[PDB]
Each structure stands twice: as C-alpha cells, then as structure tokens.
Amino acid sequence: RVVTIAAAAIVIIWAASGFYTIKEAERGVVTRFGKFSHLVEPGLNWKPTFIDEVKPVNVEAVRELAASGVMLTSDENVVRVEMNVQYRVTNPEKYLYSVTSPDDSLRQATDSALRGVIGKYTMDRILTEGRT
Amino acid sequence: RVVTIAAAAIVIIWAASGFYTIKEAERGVVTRFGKFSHLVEPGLNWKPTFIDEVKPVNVEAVRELAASGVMLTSDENVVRVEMNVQYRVTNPEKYLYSVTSPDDSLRQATDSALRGVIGKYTMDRILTEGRT
Amino acid sequence: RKVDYSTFLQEVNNDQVREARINGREINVTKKDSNRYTTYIPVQDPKLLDNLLTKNVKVVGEP
Amino acid sequence: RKVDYSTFLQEVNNDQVREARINGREINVTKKDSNRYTTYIPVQDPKLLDNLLTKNVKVVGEP
Amino acid sequence: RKVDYSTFLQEVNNDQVREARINGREINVTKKDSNRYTTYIPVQDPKLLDNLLTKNVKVVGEP
Amino acid sequence: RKVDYSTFLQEVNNDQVREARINGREINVTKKDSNRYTTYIPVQDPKLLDNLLTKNVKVVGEP
Amino acid sequence: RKVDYSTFLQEVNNDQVREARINGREINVTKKDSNRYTTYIPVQDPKLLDNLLTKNVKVVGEP
Amino acid sequence: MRKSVIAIIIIVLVVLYMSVFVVKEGERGITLRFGKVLRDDDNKPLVYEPGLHFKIPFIETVKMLDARIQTMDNQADRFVTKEKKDLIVDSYIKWRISDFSRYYLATGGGDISQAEVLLKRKFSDRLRSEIGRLDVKDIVTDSRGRLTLEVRDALNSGSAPVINPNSMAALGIEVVDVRIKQINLPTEVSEAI
Incomplete structure (x- = not known):
C-alpha cells in the first residue's frame, strides 16, 4: 500500500508543479x-516540470530606443542629432535565438544607419528641412 | 609479506605521483x-616520475610588448617613436630549445629593426604617414 | 533579476526607465525596451522622487 | 479605481483635482469633474503638501 | 575589520573606494585594491548618498 | 561624568576633542587631553555630524 | 506649572532664560531670575536648536 | 530488504542526475574529456546538436559553444586616409560560427576571446588597407556602399569548395555584416571646424 500512496503523492506533486502562468501581454517559447517545443499563448498552462522550460517574451508591448550623437555631415560640419525608434517583437523564436541581445544590436544598427543617412546631407539642409 | 606490502605502497605512490594536469590554452612537452619524444595536448595525462619530465608552455594566449625610443631620422632629426608588437608561440620545441629567453631576444630584435627602419625615411614622412 | 541602485540612477538620468513601482524599500523598474529588473534602496533619498519626476519617469505606488 | 502617483501630480498641476482626502499613504482624489479615484504615496514627498496648497486644492486629513 | 566613519569620508573624498554595500545600519566597503572592511554610520546623513554618487562609487542595497 | 551639549559643541569648535563614540541617543567622548565623558543629543541635529566632520574629529559608530 | 511653546519662543527671543533640559518632547526651563517650569513641543521643530544656540542659551540632554 | 532497495534506487537516480546532459536550443556544445574528445569521429569531432544526451560522470566535462550571431565592437581606432589626415572609426562587426569543429580546433580554446582577437586583427588589418586609398569626404559620404560591403566580402572570400587559409572561412567563423557606427576627427581638426 505504501508504493501506491508514494506514486499518488509524486504524481500529485508533478501536476502541482506543472502549472504556470503567462501574462496577457507576453507570449512564451517552450x-x-x-528542442523548441512550441509557442505558448497567455494564461494558465501546464508543462512537465524538470523536463521542459518556458521563456516569456513581451510581444504586445511597444519598445522605444533613443539614439543621440555628434555626427559629421557632408559639408565638413558636425551636428548633434537625436532620434527615437519604436519597434515591437514578432515570431519570438527569432527574437530569442537569432541574435544575442537583440536590443543592443538594434541600437548599434540604428546608430550606423543614422550615420549613413546624415553623411549625405549638408548642415543647413538638415537644420531647416530635416524631419521629413 | 612486508616486502610485498612495501612494493604495493611504492606502486601506489608511483600512480598517485605520475599524473599531471594541463590547462586548455597550454601545450606540454614530455x-x-x-631527449623529448612527445608533445601532449591539453588534457589529463600520466607520466613515469623521474623517467619523464613534462613542461607546459602557453600557446593560445598572445604576448604583447612595447618598443619606444628616441631615434635619429635620415636628415639627422630626433623623433620619439612608439610601437606595440603582438606575437604568439608555435612549435614549443623550438621555443624551449633554441634561444635563451626568447622574449628578450625578440624585444631586442624589434628594437633593432625599428631603429633600422626609422632612420631610412625623413622626419616629416615619419610624422605624417607613419601609421601605415 | 537584481540590479544595484547606482546604475539604476544613471539609467534614469539617461532616460532608459519607463515605469518604477515602489512597494517598500525595493523598486520594480521597467526599462523603455520592456526589460524589468528589481532594485533595492540603500537608504532613503529625498532627491530620488524629485529626480524620477523631472526625468518624466512613470511612478507607481503600491497598496 | 487606482491612478498612479505621477499621473495624479500631473493632474493637480493642470488644475483638475478639487479635494484630496489623505489617509496615511493612501489618498482619495476627487477631480473637479466629480470623478473619484485612489492613489498611493510611493515615498515621503515633502513637496506634495506644498504643491497641493499652492494649486488651491482642498486637503482633508482623517483619524 | 572596522573603520571609523570619518576615515570612510576622507577615503571616499580621495577616490580609492569602489563598491559600497549598504545593509541598514552597517556598511561593507570594498576598496580599489580588493580590500574589504566595515563601517558604521553615526547618525542619518543625507549628504552621504550624494557624496558617494558624485564620486562614481558603486552603491549596492540589500533586502 | 556627563558634559552639557552646549559646552560640548563649543569645545568641538575649540578643537579639543579627538574621538566621539556615538551611541544613538548617547555619545562617548575623549578630549585631546585624554579626558573621557559622555553627552546627549537633545534632538536630531545633522549640523552636529557636519561640525564634527569639518573639524577633523574622529567619529565612531558601533553594532 | 506649564508654559506655552510660543510664549517660550518670544521669551527666549528676549534673552531671559539660561538652561534648557530637553527630555524628548518636554523641556525643563529655568529663567535668568531662577524661575523653573516645563514646556511642551507641539511638533518637531528644526529651528529650535538653531535659535537656542544662536542666543547663547545652554542646553542639556537626559538619559 | 526494502532499505537496500531504497538505497539502490536512490543511488541509480543520483547516477542518472550526474550523467544527465542538457543542451539548449541557442548553443551547440560538445563534451570535454581530458584526452580524447579532440579528433573524435576521425578528423571531424562530434557536433552534439541540441537535445538529450548521456555522459560519463567524471572522464569528461561539460562546455558549450554559442551558435548565434555575436557582436564585437572596436571602441576606438586610428586610420590614415589618402590625404594623410587621421580619422577615428568606431565600428561593430557581427560574426556567426559557420562550422563548429573547425572553429574549436583552429582557435586555441573554446572561449570566444581567441576568435574575437583573431577577427579583430584581421578585420582591422583588412579595413586599414582598404581605407588608405580613399579620402575623408568619400569615407563620410558613401562608406556603406564602398567600404563595409567590400570589406565584408573580402574578409569572407579572403582575397588579397576551395578555402583560402588567409580567408576567415578557414576559421570556423563567418562574417555576416560590417557597419561603421561613428567617425571622429583629431582634436586639432575638430577645433578648427
């Protein structure tokens, strides 16, 4: 009788530890x-404890990045330029496995693109008709 | 059976003293x-004590030294010249059994070569296009 | 995740913080890129809330 | 309803609150448009009471 | 070890401390030369946290 | 022996104390002439700690 | 015999007492004419120590 | 008796726990035995793709190799243009491990530091040689169309299934993108401007 009670106890603990919660805004990668089991929607869910792991990722939220710098223009001129970049996460497996720390990579890419675009234009043209 | 016990103890001491460890970056010469007859890779190895002698040398890591000097140019002009040299070690047999203290020999060779090259060109060429 | 208070400060002055929730001594800090980390207050700082407000950082109390 | 402390300060600075009942950390805010909500003070803010009195906002304590 | 509070003050003025972990009453100081010791605050000093910040000294809280 | 607080502050401005061991409400004090006594803060005074720090007077806390 | 805190302040403003025995909230006061009484502080008053120190009024704490 | 059964089951369970092997999706890691994991499976060592695996408890040690793009940034540099004007280039390079076995064997250690310094040296050298031919205005105007793409292509190919030992393809590394973040002038030129 002891073995049956022990099995019941261990499976009860298994089920109890199996449950987890994922916030409404976020998604999960299990x-x-x-082996990248699948993609998990928000809410209460179950997983085999000590077998599979779930990583939550904020998908609904919109992320913003600020990039500022002293940048050289075409007519041997330097200008302080500030930009804001809004981006959101999709297909979270790509966001999780393609590149280490995607936010820093995007920051560096934004700085590089800003330098490339600002290099072409002259100072006065920027200062007057930049935005568009 | 005292002699047998002593012989077993000596064999156990041999086994316990023979083994040695080598770090990943290093390479051993036994x-x-x-005479040296073998070069051992970065792993756990056993050698017969007093019959084989193992020496480890770092290989992967890079050594860096500085060569700085007051120098006479082609037009008899004084210039302060600074350089950094980065080198690595290959063929540990040659590194250990060719020259006494190869680091100092390389330092002096670098200083002599830098002296020979700086004096060939004039002062302004050194000052302007010295970098490449 | 646990992050010390100083780098939280120069993150606040470099406006990478969006929402900070202060239940007790601890602060639940959310960055602009939706990355959250907890911070612990070493000692009460009268200038802390003023600095947080001037940098237009969202501040949330707790029951 | 719960409204964040920074949002409440932005509201009072814009002349939108009428009376504020302060019960320790908890504050019961009544807006000028007869909308009531509740906020919580994160940390001890000396400037809060001065800001409330300056903007001609009724302030009421409780037992 | 133990170190006087004034000793800590003049020490941080000359910029050779690196990490300062605050546990309520106690302070666990880390030197620039990997020397660790302990300091105690005489009485609540508002200038302490400001002084530690302005000299780029890491400050770490505890639960 | 107990020494009055006004006399204590005047003596500190006289630069005649060497060490002051502060125990919260209490202070244990050593004069420059190796005279030991004990004094009391009437009510919390940060200017006390400011005056002792600017006078290069040793300040000691304890667990 | 109990004396108003305000009356205490304009009385000491007139340089008329000598000693102030501070026991937490209550204060034992002796005038220049050897008249002794007790006064009570309504709330914490930081300017109290500055005013008492400026006008050469001696203060003594209690264990 | 039942005590012996409990002892044997717990001992086999702890043996399994000590011998369990887990590899995450992000990285591919191979076992590190002191002597023999080198030259496993004839010339090419085992790759050990992510998944469950079994390991001998003490003859080998766990270690992992990352399998996604890494970024290496050069904080400051000094370059001489064609007209002998100094320039400071702050640039980042993104590299992906192409073949894991050759990446492990060619680098001194599994640590990414050795590969990073090799890549920095080659990239810096490659960049320096390429830039010297151009002028600062052309550098600041259309660098991405004339420097970065060309440097990346040259570093991949190795110019100046055939693999050039000079090329980075000889190493397990591959370069996926090269960008120039910031360009700075010497303090004298900046003050003049």
Missing part, C-alpha cells in the same frame, strides 16, 4: 530539453 | 630523460 522547449523540451532544448 | 622529455624521455634528456
């Missing part, structure tokens, strides 16, 4: 022993 | 008495 991997069973690191 | 010498059979005076």
Whole structure:
C-alpha cells in the first residue's frame, strides 16, 4: 500500500508543479530539453516540470530606443542629432535565438544607419528641412 | 609479506605521483630523460616520475610588448617613436630549445629593426604617414 | 533579476526607465525596451522622487 | 479605481483635482469633474503638501 | 575589520573606494585594491548618498 | 561624568576633542587631553555630524 | 506649572532664560531670575536648536 | 530488504542526475574529456546538436559553444586616409560560427576571446588597407556602399569548395555584416571646424 500512496503523492506533486502562468501581454517559447517545443499563448498552462522550460517574451508591448550623437555631415560640419525608434517583437523564436541581445544590436544598427543617412546631407539642409 | 606490502605502497605512490594536469590554452612537452619524444595536448595525462619530465608552455594566449625610443631620422632629426608588437608561440620545441629567453631576444630584435627602419625615411614622412 | 541602485540612477538620468513601482524599500523598474529588473534602496533619498519626476519617469505606488 | 502617483501630480498641476482626502499613504482624489479615484504615496514627498496648497486644492486629513 | 566613519569620508573624498554595500545600519566597503572592511554610520546623513554618487562609487542595497 | 551639549559643541569648535563614540541617543567622548565623558543629543541635529566632520574629529559608530 | 511653546519662543527671543533640559518632547526651563517650569513641543521643530544656540542659551540632554 | 532497495534506487537516480546532459536550443556544445574528445569521429569531432544526451560522470566535462550571431565592437581606432589626415572609426562587426569543429580546433580554446582577437586583427588589418586609398569626404559620404560591403566580402572570400587559409572561412567563423557606427576627427581638426 505504501508504493501506491508514494506514486499518488509524486504524481500529485508533478501536476502541482506543472502549472504556470503567462501574462496577457507576453507570449512564451517552450522547449523540451532544448528542442523548441512550441509557442505558448497567455494564461494558465501546464508543462512537465524538470523536463521542459518556458521563456516569456513581451510581444504586445511597444519598445522605444533613443539614439543621440555628434555626427559629421557632408559639408565638413558636425551636428548633434537625436532620434527615437519604436519597434515591437514578432515570431519570438527569432527574437530569442537569432541574435544575442537583440536590443543592443538594434541600437548599434540604428546608430550606423543614422550615420549613413546624415553623411549625405549638408548642415543647413538638415537644420531647416530635416524631419521629413 | 612486508616486502610485498612495501612494493604495493611504492606502486601506489608511483600512480598517485605520475599524473599531471594541463590547462586548455597550454601545450606540454614530455622529455624521455634528456631527449623529448612527445608533445601532449591539453588534457589529463600520466607520466613515469623521474623517467619523464613534462613542461607546459602557453600557446593560445598572445604576448604583447612595447618598443619606444628616441631615434635619429635620415636628415639627422630626433623623433620619439612608439610601437606595440603582438606575437604568439608555435612549435614549443623550438621555443624551449633554441634561444635563451626568447622574449628578450625578440624585444631586442624589434628594437633593432625599428631603429633600422626609422632612420631610412625623413622626419616629416615619419610624422605624417607613419601609421601605415 | 537584481540590479544595484547606482546604475539604476544613471539609467534614469539617461532616460532608459519607463515605469518604477515602489512597494517598500525595493523598486520594480521597467526599462523603455520592456526589460524589468528589481532594485533595492540603500537608504532613503529625498532627491530620488524629485529626480524620477523631472526625468518624466512613470511612478507607481503600491497598496 | 487606482491612478498612479505621477499621473495624479500631473493632474493637480493642470488644475483638475478639487479635494484630496489623505489617509496615511493612501489618498482619495476627487477631480473637479466629480470623478473619484485612489492613489498611493510611493515615498515621503515633502513637496506634495506644498504643491497641493499652492494649486488651491482642498486637503482633508482623517483619524 | 572596522573603520571609523570619518576615515570612510576622507577615503571616499580621495577616490580609492569602489563598491559600497549598504545593509541598514552597517556598511561593507570594498576598496580599489580588493580590500574589504566595515563601517558604521553615526547618525542619518543625507549628504552621504550624494557624496558617494558624485564620486562614481558603486552603491549596492540589500533586502 | 556627563558634559552639557552646549559646552560640548563649543569645545568641538575649540578643537579639543579627538574621538566621539556615538551611541544613538548617547555619545562617548575623549578630549585631546585624554579626558573621557559622555553627552546627549537633545534632538536630531545633522549640523552636529557636519561640525564634527569639518573639524577633523574622529567619529565612531558601533553594532 | 506649564508654559506655552510660543510664549517660550518670544521669551527666549528676549534673552531671559539660561538652561534648557530637553527630555524628548518636554523641556525643563529655568529663567535668568531662577524661575523653573516645563514646556511642551507641539511638533518637531528644526529651528529650535538653531535659535537656542544662536542666543547663547545652554542646553542639556537626559538619559 | 526494502532499505537496500531504497538505497539502490536512490543511488541509480543520483547516477542518472550526474550523467544527465542538457543542451539548449541557442548553443551547440560538445563534451570535454581530458584526452580524447579532440579528433573524435576521425578528423571531424562530434557536433552534439541540441537535445538529450548521456555522459560519463567524471572522464569528461561539460562546455558549450554559442551558435548565434555575436557582436564585437572596436571602441576606438586610428586610420590614415589618402590625404594623410587621421580619422577615428568606431565600428561593430557581427560574426556567426559557420562550422563548429573547425572553429574549436583552429582557435586555441573554446572561449570566444581567441576568435574575437583573431577577427579583430584581421578585420582591422583588412579595413586599414582598404581605407588608405580613399579620402575623408568619400569615407563620410558613401562608406556603406564602398567600404563595409567590400570589406565584408573580402574578409569572407579572403582575397588579397576551395578555402583560402588567409580567408576567415578557414576559421570556423563567418562574417555576416560590417557597419561603421561613428567617425571622429583629431582634436586639432575638430577645433578648427
């Protein structure tokens, strides 16, 4: 009788530890022993404890980045330029496995693109008709 | 059976003293008495004590030294010249059994070569296009 | 995640923080890129809330 | 309803609140448009009471 | 070890401390030369936190 | 032996104290002439700690 | 015999008492004419120590 | 008795726990035995793709190799243009491990530091040689169309299934993108401007 009660107890603990919650805004990526099991919607869900792991990622929220710098223009001129970049996460497996720390990579890419675009234009043209 | 026990103890001491460890970046050279007959990779290895002598040398890591000097140019002009040299070690047999203290020899060779090259060109060429 | 208070400050002055929730000594900090990390107050700072407000940082109390 | 402390300060600075009942950390805000909500003071803010009195806002304590 | 509070003050003025972990009453100081010791505050000093910040000294809180 | 607070502050401005061990409400004080006594803060005074720090007077806290 | 705190302030403003025995909230006061009484502080008053120190009024704490 | 059964089951469970192997989706890691993991499976060592695996408890040690794009930034640099005017280029390079076995064998260690310094040296050298031919105005105007793409293509190909030992393809690394973040002038030129 002891073995049956022990089995009942261990399966009860298994089920109790199986449940987890994912916030409404976020999504989840579940991997069973690191094999990318599937994509998990928000709410209450169940997973085999000590077998698969779930990583939550904020998808609904909109992320903003600020990029500022002293930048050289075409007519041997330097200007302080500030930009804001709004971006959102999609297909979270790409956001999680393609590039380490995607936010820093996007920051560096934004700085590079800003330098490339600002290099072409002259100072007065920027200062007057920049925005568009 | 006292002699047998002593012999077993000596064998156990041999086994416990033979083994040595090598870090990942290093490479070992094992010498059979005076002669070296094998080079050992970065892993756990066993050697017969007093019959084989192991010496580890770092390989992957890069050494960096500085060569700075007051120098006479082609037109008899004084210039302060600074350079950094980065080198690595290959063929540990040559690194250990060719020159006494190869680091100092390389330092002096770098200083002599830099002296020979700086004096060939005039002062302004060194000042302007010295970088490449 | 636990992050110390100083770098939280120069993140605040460099406006990477969006929402900060202060239940007790601890602060639940959310960055502009929706990355959240907890911070602990070493000692009460009268200038802390003023600095947070001037930098237009969202501040949330707790029950 | 719960409204954040920074939002409440932005509201009072814009002349939108009428009376504020302060019960310790908790504050019961009544707007000029007869809308009531509740906020909480994150940390001790000396400037809060001065800001409330300056903007001609009724302030009421409680037992 | 233990170190006087004034010693800590003049020490941080000369910029050779690196990490300062605040646990309520106690302070666990880390030197620039990997030297660790302990300091205690005489009485609540508002200028302490400002002084530590302006000299780029890491400050770490505790739960 | 207990020494009056006004006399204590005047003596500190006289630069005649060397060490002051502060125990919260209490202070244990050593004069420059190796005279030991004990004094009391009437009510919390940060200017006390300011005066002792600017006078290069040793200040000691304890666990 | 109990004396108003305000009356205490204009009385000491007139340089008429000598000693102030501060026991938490209550204060034992002796005038220049050897008249002794007790006064009570309504709330915490930081300017009290500055005013008492400026006008050469001696203060003594209690264990 | 039942005590012996409990002892044996707990001992086999702890043996399994000590011998369990887990590899995450992000990175591919191979076992590190002191002597033999080098030259496993004839010339090419085992790759050990992500998933469950079994390991000998003490003959080998766990270690992982990352399998996604890394970024290496050069904080400051000094370059001489064609007209002998100094320039400071702050640029970042993104690199992906192409073949894991050759990446491990060619680099001194599994640590990314050695590969990073090799890439920095080659990239810096490659960049310096390329820039010297141009002028500062052309550098600041259309660098991406004339420097970065050309440097990336040259570093991948190795000019100036055939693999050039000079090329980075000889190493396990591959370069996916090269960008120039910031360009700065010497303090004298900046003060003049």
